[PDB]
Amino acid sequence: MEHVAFGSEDIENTLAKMDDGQLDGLAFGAIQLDGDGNILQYNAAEGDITGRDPKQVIGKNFFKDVAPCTDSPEFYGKFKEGVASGNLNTMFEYTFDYQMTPTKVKVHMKKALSGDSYWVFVKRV
Numbered sequence: 566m567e568h569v570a571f572g573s574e575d576i577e578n579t580l581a582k583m584d585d586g587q588l589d590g591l592a593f594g595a596i597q598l599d600g601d602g603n604i605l606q607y608n609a610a611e612g613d614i615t616g617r618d619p620k621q622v623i624g625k626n627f628f629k630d631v632a633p634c635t636d637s638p639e640f641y642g643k644f645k646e647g648v649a650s651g652n653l654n655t656m657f658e659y660t661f662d663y664q665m666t667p668t669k670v671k672v673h674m675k676k677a678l679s680g681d682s683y684w685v686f687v688k689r690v
């Protein structure tokens with residue numbers, strides 16, 4: 566298992582070296598979205614939390630298709646604000662409840678080191 570702590574200050578640098586396979590080795594869920602909310606990456610830990618099969622969600626829009634409970638000012642709103650601002654680094658609790666047992670989680674969104682890509686890190690609370 567890759568040794569990286571949720572919420573680590575330089576997490577974006579560390580994950581820039583990881584391929585989809587090493588990303589599956591994290592202790593928390595990790596989703597990479599492009600500026601429009603499309604899923605580029607989605608690790609195994611996230612699949613365990615959301616129950617969705619990784620390879621099947623990639624390419625799908627996170628706010629419209631996959632996680633509609635996140636289509637709100639509290640989640641999607643902070644994301645859209647961050648993309649347009651070109652900066653994003655926020656953490657908060659949220660409850661995941663679309664087609665799944667209501668699950669409380671800690672979310673951490675942060676701009677990737679890459680160009681137009683952003684990270685959503687998820688862990689159980």
Ligand SMILES: *C(=O)/C=C\c1ccc(O)cc1
Pocket residue numbers: 615617631632633634635660661662663664
């Ligand atoms: C609200 O809907 C939050 C998260 C979420 C994640 C994965 C899937 O499939 C649905 C919903």
